[PDB]
Design a protein around this ligand. Sequence first.
Ligand SMILES: [Mg+2]
Ligand SMILES: [Mg+2]
Length: 501
Amino acid sequence: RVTLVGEMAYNEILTPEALSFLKELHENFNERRIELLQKRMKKQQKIDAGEFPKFLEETKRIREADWTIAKLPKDLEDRRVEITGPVDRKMVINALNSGAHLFMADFEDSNSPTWENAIEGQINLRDAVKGTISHKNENGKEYRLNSKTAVLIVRPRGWHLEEKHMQVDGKNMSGSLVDFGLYFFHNAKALLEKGSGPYFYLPKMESYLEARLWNDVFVFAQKYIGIPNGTIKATVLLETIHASFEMDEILYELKDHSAGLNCGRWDYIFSFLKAFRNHNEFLLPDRAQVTMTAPFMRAYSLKVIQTCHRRNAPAIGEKVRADKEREALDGHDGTWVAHPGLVPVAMEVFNHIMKTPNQIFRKREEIHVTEKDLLEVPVGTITEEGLRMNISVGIQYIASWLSGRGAAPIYNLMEDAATAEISRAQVWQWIRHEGGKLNDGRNITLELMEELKEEELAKIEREIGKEAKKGRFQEATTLFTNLVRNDEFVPFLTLPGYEIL
Ligand SMILES: [Mg+2]
Ligand SMILES: [Mg+2]
């Protein structure tokens, strides 16, 4: 028995037919999802005991074999620029019209997972696929879609999140299955008719078994609505240290439904810190100093490019321009932006270096990335500014998120949950580490964190105003403080955040 708990046009997405499909998703796959999350806890015990991720002996055959992913649709051949944004009505239109080749419509990191956002998200995407989506201004303006838009790709919540507003026999539904299920149900056939398809961005996976789970979901889904296997195309965000040792295996489990991999910065550095948080030598510098040229991040990107291109799949990626230029020269088939205005920038670099639709033919045969290359701790300094930035951005981001805005322009960077995660994670680590000391020599202590926290909160109230306040800063501050003070390390701030959201 299915219970719908949230307040309620929502009837049009939550139809008995759509819900019957979600119920079957749940009965088939939720328990496996929970099992895999339990396997993560077990793996953490092994890592804590000194057993690092490794290239698995058990899957050597997959790695030696000469298979490739299934053939990509034409609209996934050239992915030079992708833009990311939440499933907010106005942002969906701006992103689709941005000139990006693809738009990753986000239910995950840049989306605050309110019930309203989760279902309005689906309404908005349904209207976008139909062409009826519009955003009305009070001044009369009403934005609509170009007749040719960026290709739509959806990112659902990761496997650790639940949708507490629908239950099956009292057990919360998987956020992943809900976000994927409703978009698939309502749009797969229309997407096919316009010559595209149901495409996904799969986040935060830690194991190929988690890739298998997605694959099994796709198989069931296609069968359920009666379209052929191999029609769903999913790009995997290769964004956890665990996954860097299972890239090939991950593509393999998904091979009939694969559109390759994508590299990140913050979720990946977060993952690295979280996994090795009990290892004393894995102390990190200011996150700003941990750039894509840091040796372990370089090894990561190159291994993604080499693995993807080997399986005939895409590998998606002033200082911004140097950065994109490095990605193109290295062999990435495309790159990401989080704002409409930065498309031209990204577009220019890739149009100059990558005149071919992609560069999957670049095998990067000459490089060899070892396990040690992947694990090498980055060296730099920890700085008063970096510590103030971590505190300020963490709190402002969490206030924004509790206020229902998961895409937060802070110090004009478009920030998402991964920014806040690395922010809280660094402060948590620096307070604790014996080496957790500012550049000037000051010990990073609870007292200093607290005193710096007060000053930043004074500064925020000055930039934003007393009334803004209504932005749930009290709660954001409390949560951030609990996150950095708790010795246990909550796996994701959205876990406690979801409870109080
Ligand atoms: Mg991410
Ligand atoms: Mg240790």
